[PDB]
PDB file of C-alpha atoms and ligand atoms in Angstrom:
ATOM      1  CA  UNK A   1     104.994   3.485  28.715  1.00  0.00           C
ATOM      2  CA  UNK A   2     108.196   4.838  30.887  1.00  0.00           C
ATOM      3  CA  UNK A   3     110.076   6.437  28.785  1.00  0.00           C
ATOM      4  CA  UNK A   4     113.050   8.862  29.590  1.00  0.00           C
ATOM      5  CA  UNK A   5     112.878  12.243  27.618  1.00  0.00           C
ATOM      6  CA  UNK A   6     116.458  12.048  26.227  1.00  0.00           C
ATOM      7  CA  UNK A   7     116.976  12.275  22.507  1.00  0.00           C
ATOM      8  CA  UNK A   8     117.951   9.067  20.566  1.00  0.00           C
ATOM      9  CA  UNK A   9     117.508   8.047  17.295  1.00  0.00           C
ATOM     10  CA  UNK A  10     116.760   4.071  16.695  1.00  0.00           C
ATOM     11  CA  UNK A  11     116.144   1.430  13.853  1.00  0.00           C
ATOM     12  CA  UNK A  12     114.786  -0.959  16.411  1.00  0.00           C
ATOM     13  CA  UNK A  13     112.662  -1.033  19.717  1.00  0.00           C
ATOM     14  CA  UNK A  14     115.534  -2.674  21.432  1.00  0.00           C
ATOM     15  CA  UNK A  15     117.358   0.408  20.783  1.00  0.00           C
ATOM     16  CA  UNK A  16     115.905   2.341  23.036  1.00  0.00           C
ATOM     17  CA  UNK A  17     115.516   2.718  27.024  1.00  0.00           C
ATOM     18  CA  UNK A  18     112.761   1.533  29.629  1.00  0.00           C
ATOM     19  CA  UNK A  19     109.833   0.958  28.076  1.00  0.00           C
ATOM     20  CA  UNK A  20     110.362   3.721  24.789  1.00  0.00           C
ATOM     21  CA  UNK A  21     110.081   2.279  21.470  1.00  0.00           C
ATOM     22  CA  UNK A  22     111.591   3.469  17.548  1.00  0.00           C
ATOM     23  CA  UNK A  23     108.863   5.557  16.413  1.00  0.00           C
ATOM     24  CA  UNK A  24     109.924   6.653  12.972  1.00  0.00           C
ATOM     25  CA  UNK A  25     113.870   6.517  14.210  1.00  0.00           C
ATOM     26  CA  UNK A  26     113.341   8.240  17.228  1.00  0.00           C
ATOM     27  CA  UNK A  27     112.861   6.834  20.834  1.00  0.00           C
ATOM     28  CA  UNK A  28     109.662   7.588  22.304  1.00  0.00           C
TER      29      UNK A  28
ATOM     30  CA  UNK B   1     108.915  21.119  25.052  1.00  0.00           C
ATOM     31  CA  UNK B   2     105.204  20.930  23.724  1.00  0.00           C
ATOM     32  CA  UNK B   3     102.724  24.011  24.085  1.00  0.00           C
ATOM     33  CA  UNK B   4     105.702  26.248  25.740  1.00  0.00           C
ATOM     34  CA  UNK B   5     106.633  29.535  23.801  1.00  0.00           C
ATOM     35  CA  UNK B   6     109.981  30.587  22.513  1.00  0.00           C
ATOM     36  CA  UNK B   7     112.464  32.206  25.529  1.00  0.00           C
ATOM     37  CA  UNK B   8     113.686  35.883  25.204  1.00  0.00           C
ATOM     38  CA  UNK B   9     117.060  36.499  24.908  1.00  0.00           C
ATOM     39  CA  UNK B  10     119.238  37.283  27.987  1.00  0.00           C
ATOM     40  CA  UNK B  11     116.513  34.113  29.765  1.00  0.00           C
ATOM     41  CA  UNK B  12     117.417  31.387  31.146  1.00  0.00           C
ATOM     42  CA  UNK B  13     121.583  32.140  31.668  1.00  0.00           C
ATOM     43  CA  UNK B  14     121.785  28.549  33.531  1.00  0.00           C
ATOM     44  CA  UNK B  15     120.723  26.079  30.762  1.00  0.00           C
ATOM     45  CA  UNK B  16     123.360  24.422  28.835  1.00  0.00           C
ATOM     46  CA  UNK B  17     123.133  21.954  26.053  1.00  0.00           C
ATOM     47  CA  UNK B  18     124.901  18.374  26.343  1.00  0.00           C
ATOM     48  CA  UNK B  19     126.471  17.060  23.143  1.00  0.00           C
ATOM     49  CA  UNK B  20     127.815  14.014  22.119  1.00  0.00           C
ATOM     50  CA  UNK B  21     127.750  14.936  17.988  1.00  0.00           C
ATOM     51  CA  UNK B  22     124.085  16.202  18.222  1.00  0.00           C
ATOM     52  CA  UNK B  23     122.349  17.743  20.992  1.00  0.00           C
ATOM     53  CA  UNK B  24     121.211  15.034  23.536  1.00  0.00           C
ATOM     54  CA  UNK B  25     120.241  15.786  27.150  1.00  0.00           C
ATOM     55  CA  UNK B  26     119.625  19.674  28.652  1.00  0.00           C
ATOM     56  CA  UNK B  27     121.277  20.856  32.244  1.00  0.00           C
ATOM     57  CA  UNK B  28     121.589  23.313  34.457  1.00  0.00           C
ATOM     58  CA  UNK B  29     124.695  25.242  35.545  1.00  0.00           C
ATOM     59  CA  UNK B  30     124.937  25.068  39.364  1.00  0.00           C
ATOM     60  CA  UNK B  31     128.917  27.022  40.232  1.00  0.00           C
ATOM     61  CA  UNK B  32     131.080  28.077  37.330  1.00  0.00           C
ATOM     62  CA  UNK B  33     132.415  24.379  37.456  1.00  0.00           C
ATOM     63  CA  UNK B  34     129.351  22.032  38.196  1.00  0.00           C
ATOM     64  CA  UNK B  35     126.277  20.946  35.778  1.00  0.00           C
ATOM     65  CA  UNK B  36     123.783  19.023  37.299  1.00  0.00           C
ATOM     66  CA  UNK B  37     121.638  17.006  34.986  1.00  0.00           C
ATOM     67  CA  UNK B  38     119.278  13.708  34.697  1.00  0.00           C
ATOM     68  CA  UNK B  39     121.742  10.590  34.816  1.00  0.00           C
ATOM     69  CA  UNK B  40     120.042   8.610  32.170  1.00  0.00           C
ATOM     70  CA  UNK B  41     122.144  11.122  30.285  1.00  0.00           C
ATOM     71  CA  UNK B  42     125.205   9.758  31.247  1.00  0.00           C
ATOM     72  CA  UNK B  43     127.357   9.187  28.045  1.00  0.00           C
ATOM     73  CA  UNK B  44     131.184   8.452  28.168  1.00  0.00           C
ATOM     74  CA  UNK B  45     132.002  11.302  26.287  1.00  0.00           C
ATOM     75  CA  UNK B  46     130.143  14.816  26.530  1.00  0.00           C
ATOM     76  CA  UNK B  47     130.644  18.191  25.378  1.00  0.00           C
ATOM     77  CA  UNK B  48     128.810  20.992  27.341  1.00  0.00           C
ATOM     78  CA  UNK B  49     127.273  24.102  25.381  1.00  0.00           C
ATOM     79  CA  UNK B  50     126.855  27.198  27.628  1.00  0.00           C
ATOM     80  CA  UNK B  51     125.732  30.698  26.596  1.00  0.00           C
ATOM     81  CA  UNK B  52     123.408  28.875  23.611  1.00  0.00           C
ATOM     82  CA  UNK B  53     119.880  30.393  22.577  1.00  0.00           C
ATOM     83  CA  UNK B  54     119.461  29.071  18.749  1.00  0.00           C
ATOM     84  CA  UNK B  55     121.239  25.531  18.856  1.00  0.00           C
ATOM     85  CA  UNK B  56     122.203  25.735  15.224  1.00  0.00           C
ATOM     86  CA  UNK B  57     124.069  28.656  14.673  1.00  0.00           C
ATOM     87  CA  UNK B  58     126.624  30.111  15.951  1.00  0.00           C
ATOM     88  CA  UNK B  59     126.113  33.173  17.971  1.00  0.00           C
ATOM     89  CA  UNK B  60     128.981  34.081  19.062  1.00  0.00           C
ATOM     90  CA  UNK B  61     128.276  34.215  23.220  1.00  0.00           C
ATOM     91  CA  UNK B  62     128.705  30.214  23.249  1.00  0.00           C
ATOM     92  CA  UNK B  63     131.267  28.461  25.732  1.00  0.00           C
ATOM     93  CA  UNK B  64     132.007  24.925  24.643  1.00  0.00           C
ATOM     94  CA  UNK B  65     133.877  23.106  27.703  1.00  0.00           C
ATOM     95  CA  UNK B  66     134.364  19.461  28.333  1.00  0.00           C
ATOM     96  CA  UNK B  67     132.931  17.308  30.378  1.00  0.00           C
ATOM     97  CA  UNK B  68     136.508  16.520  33.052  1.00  0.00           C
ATOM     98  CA  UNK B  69     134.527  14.385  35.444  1.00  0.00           C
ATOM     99  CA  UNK B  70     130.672  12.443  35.238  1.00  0.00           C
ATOM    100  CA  UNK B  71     129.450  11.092  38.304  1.00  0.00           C
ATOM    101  CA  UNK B  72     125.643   9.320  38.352  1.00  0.00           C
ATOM    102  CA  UNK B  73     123.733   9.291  41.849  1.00  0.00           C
ATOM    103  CA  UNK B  74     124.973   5.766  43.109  1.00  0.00           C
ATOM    104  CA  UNK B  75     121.614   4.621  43.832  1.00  0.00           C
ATOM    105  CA  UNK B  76     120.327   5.629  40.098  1.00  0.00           C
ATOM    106  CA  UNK B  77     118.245   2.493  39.082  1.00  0.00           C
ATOM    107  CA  UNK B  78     118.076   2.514  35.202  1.00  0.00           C
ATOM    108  CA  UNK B  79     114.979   0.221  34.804  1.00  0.00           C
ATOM    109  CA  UNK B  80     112.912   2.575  36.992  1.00  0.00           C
ATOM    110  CA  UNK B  81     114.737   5.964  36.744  1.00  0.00           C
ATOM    111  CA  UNK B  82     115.018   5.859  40.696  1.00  0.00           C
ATOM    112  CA  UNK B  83     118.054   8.711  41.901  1.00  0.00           C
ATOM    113  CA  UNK B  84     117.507  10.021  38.113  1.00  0.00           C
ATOM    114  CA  UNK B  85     120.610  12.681  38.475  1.00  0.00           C
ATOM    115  CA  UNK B  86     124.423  13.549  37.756  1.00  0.00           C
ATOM    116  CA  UNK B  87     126.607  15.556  38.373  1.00  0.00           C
ATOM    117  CA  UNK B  88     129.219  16.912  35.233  1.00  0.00           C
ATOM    118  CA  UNK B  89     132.770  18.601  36.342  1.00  0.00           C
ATOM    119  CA  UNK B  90     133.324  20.921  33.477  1.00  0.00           C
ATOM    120  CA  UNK B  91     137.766  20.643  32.287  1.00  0.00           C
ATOM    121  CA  UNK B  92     138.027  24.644  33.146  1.00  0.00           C
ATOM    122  CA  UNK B  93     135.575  26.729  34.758  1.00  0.00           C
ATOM    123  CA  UNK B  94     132.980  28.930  32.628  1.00  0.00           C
ATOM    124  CA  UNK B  95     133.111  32.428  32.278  1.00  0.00           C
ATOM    125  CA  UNK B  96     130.093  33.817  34.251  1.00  0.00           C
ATOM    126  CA  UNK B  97     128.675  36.800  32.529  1.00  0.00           C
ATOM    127  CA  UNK B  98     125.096  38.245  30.919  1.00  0.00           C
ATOM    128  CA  UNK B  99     124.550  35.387  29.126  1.00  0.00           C
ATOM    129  CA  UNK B 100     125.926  32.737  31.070  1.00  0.00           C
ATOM    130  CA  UNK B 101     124.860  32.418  35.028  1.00  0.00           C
ATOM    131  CA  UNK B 102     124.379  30.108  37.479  1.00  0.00           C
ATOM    132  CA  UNK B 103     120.993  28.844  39.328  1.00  0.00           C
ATOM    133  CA  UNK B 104     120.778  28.076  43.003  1.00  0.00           C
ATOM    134  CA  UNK B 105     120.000  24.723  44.598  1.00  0.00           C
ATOM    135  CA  UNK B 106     117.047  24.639  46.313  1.00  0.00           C
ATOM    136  CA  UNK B 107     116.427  25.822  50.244  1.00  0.00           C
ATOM    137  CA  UNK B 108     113.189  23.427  50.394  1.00  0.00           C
ATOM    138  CA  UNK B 109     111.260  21.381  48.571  1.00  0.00           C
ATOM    139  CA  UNK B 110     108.763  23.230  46.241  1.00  0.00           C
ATOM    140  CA  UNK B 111     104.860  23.051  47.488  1.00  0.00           C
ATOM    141  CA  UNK B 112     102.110  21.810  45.409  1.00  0.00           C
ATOM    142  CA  UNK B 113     100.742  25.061  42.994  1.00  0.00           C
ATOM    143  CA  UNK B 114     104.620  26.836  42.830  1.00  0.00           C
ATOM    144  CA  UNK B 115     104.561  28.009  39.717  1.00  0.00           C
ATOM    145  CA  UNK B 116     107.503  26.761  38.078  1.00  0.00           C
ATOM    146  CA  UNK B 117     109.719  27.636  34.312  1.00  0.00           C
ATOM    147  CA  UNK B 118     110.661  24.864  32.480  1.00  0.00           C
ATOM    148  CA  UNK B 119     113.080  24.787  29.329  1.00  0.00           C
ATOM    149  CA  UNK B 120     114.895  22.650  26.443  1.00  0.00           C
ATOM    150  CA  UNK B 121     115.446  21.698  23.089  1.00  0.00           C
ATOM    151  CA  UNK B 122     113.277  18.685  23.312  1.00  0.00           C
ATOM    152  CA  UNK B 123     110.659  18.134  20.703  1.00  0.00           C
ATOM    153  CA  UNK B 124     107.371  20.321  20.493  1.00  0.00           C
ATOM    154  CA  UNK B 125     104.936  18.130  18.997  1.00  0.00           C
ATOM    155  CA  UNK B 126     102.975  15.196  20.910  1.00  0.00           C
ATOM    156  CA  UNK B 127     102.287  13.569  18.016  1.00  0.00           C
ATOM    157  CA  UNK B 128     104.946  13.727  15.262  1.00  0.00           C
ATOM    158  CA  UNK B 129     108.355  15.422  15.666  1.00  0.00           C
ATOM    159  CA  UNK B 130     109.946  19.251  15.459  1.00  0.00           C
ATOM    160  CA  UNK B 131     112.640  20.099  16.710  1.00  0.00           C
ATOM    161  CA  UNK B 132     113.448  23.709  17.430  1.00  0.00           C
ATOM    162  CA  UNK B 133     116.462  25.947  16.560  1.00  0.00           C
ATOM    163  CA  UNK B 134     115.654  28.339  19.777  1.00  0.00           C
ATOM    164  CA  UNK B 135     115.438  27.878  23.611  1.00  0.00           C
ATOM    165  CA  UNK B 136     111.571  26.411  24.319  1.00  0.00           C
ATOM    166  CA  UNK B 137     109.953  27.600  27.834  1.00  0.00           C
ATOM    167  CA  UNK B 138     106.667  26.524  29.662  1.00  0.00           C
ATOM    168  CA  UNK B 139     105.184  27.798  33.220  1.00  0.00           C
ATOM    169  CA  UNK B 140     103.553  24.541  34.821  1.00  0.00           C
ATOM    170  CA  UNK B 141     102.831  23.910  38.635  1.00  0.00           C
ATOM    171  CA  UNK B 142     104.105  21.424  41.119  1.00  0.00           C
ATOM    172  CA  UNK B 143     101.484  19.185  41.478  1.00  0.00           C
ATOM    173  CA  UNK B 144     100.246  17.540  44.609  1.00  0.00           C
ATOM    174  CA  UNK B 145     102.433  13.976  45.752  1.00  0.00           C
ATOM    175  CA  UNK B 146      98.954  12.573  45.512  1.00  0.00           C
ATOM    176  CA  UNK B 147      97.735  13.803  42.052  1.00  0.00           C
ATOM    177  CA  UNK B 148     100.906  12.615  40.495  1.00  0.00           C
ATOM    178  CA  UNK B 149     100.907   9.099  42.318  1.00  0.00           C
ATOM    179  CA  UNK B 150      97.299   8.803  40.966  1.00  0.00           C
ATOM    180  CA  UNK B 151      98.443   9.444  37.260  1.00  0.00           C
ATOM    181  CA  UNK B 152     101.488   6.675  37.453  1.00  0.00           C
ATOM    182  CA  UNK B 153      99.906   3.972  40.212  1.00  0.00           C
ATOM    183  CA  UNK B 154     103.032   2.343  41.606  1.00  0.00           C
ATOM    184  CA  UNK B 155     106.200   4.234  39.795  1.00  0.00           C
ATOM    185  CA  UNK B 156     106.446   7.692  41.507  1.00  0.00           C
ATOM    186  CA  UNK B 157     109.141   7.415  44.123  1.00  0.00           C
ATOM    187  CA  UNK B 158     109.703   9.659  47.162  1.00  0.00           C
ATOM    188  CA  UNK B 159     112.524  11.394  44.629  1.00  0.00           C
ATOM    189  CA  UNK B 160     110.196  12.281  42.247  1.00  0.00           C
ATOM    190  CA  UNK B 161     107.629  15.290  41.485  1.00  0.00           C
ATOM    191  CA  UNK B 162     105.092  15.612  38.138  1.00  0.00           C
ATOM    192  CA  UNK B 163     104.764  19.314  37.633  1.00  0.00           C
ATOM    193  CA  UNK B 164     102.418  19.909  34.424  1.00  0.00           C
ATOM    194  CA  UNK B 165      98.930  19.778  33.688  1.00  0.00           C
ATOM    195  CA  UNK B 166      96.418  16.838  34.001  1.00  0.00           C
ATOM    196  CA  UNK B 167      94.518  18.030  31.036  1.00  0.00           C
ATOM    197  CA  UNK B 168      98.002  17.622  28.665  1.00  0.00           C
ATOM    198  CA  UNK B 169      98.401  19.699  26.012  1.00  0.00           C
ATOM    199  CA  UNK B 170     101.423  21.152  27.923  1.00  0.00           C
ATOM    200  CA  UNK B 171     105.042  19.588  28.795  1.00  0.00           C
ATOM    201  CA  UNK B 172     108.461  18.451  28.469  1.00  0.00           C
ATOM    202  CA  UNK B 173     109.329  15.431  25.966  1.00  0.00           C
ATOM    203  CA  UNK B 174     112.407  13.976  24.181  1.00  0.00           C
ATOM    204  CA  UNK B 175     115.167  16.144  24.346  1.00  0.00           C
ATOM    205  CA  UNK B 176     114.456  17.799  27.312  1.00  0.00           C
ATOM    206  CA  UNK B 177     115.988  15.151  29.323  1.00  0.00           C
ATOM    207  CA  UNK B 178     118.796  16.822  32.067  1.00  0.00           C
ATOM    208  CA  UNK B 179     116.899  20.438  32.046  1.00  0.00           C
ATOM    209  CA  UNK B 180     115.827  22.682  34.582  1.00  0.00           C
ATOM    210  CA  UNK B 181     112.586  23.278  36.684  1.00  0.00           C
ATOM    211  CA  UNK B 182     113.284  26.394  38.623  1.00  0.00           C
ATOM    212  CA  UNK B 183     110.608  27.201  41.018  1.00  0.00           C
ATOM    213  CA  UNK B 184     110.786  30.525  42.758  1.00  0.00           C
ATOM    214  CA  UNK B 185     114.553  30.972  41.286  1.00  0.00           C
ATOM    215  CA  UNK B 186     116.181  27.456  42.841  1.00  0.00           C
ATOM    216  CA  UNK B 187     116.464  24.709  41.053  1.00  0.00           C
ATOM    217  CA  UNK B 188     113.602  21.897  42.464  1.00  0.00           C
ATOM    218  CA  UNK B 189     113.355  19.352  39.269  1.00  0.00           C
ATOM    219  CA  UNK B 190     115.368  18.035  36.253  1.00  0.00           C
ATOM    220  CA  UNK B 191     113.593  17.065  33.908  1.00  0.00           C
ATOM    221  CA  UNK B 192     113.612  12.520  33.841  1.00  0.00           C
ATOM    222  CA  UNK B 193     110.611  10.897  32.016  1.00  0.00           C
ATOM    223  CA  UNK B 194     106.517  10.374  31.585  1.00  0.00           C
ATOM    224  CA  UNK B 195     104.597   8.645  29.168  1.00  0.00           C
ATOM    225  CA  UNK B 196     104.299  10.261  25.762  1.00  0.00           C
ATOM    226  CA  UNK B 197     104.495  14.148  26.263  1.00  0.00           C
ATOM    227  CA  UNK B 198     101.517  16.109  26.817  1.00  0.00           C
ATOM    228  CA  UNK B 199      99.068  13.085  27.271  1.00  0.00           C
ATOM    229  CA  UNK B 200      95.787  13.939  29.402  1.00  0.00           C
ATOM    230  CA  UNK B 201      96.602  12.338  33.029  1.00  0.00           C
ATOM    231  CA  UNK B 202     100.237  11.756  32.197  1.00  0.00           C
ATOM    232  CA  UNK B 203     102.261  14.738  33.368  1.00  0.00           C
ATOM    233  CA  UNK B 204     105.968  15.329  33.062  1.00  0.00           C
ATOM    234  CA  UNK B 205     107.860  13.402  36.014  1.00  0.00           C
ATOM    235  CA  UNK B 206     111.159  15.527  37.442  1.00  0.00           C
ATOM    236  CA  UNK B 207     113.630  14.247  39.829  1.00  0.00           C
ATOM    237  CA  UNK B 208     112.996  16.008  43.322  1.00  0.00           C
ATOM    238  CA  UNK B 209     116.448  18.061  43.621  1.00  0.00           C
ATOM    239  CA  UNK B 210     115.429  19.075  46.956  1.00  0.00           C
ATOM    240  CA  UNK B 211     116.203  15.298  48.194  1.00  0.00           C
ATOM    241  CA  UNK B 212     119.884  15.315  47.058  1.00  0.00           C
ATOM    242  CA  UNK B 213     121.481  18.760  48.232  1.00  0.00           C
ATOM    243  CA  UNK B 214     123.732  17.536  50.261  1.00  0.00           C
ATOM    244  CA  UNK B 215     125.059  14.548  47.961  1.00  0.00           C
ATOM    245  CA  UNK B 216     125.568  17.613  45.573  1.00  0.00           C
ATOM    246  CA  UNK B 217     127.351  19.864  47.917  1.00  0.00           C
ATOM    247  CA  UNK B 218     129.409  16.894  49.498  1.00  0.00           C
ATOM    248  CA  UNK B 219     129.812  15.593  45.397  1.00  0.00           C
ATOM    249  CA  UNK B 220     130.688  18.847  44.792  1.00  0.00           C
ATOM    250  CA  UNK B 221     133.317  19.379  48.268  1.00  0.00           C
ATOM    251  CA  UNK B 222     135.345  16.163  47.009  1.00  0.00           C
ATOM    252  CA  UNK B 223     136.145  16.460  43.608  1.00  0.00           C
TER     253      UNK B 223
HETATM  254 CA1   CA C   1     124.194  29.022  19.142  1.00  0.00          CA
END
């Protein structure tokens, strides 16, 4: 899915940018 | 980076790490005053780490300078990483020396097969997470415009290149964000996005710094 390569931790999907989601509290 | 090796010392004098608390975004030291990196990266508050090889200790050839001024391409489209770059004006100027140097814009845009060296911080598994202490490098080709428009139908832009590998197993992922491509010693990508890292078909994607030299040197002449 797009998803920028920058480094972000997350609890949810929403957290995260373009189409990454919260894979184990990372964006990816 | 996935399937890269560890960089030497003295490599790679132009990276610099950007921190907000924990290391975030990569980018590439352009003048002794300039960083350019991806603009997705943009935060309101960034630190920028030259001179760094091991990201977690102390060395003792790191520069720490803050970011004075952030300016994102004006065009940048968040949604579809369109004009993915930004310029950072470091508060003083860095001390140019061994370890710290700069990298030079580009004179043309890179052909398909340039063999290019691409490094970060980013994580180095496709499927799980690791995240090194030391400066990760890989050597991947530009690939053709029409390769790379074949592997994401409808989302490569005229600003964008995929350097990598179709077969996977080799390329940049999260972390990486901001970094460098340098292809023949100028600076032709920065590392912006892709799908997964390393997937078969789904290369890295770069922002094509040959298409904004003269926004950076004009950026650059008024501020
Ligand atoms: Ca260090």
């Amino acid at each position: 899915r797009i998803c920028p390569r920058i480094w972000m931790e997350c609890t949810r999907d929403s957290d995260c940018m373009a189409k990454c989601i919260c894979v184990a509290g990372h964006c990816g | 980076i996935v399937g890269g090796y560890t960089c030497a010392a003295n490599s790679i004098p132009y990276q610099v790490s950007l921190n907000s608390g924990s290391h975030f975004c990569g980018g590439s030291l352009i003048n002794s005053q300039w960083v350019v990196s991806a603009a997705h990266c943009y935060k309101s508050r960034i630190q920028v780490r030259l001179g760094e090889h091991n990201i977690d200790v102390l060395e003792g050839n790191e520069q720490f300078i803050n970011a004075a001024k952030i300016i994102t391409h004006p065009n940048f489209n968040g949604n579809t990483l369109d004009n993915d770059i930004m310029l950072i004006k470091l508060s003083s100027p860095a001390t140019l020396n061994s370890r710290v140097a700069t990298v030079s814009l580009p004179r043309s845009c890179a052909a398909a097969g340039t063999e290019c060296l691409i490094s970060g911080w980013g994580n180095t598994k496709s499927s799980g997470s690791s995240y090194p202490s030391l400066l990760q490098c890989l050597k991947a080709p530009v690939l053709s415009n029409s390769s790379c428009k074949s592997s994401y139908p409808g989302q490569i832009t005229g600003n964008m290149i995929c350097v990598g590998f179709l077969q996977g197993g080799k390329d940049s992922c999260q972390g990486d964000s901001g970094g460098p491509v340098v292809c023949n010693g100028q600076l032709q990508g920065i590392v912006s996005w892709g799908y997964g890292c390393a997937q078969k078909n789904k290369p890295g994607v770069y922002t094509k710094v040959c298409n904004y030299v003269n926004w950076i040197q004009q950026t650059i002449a008024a501020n």
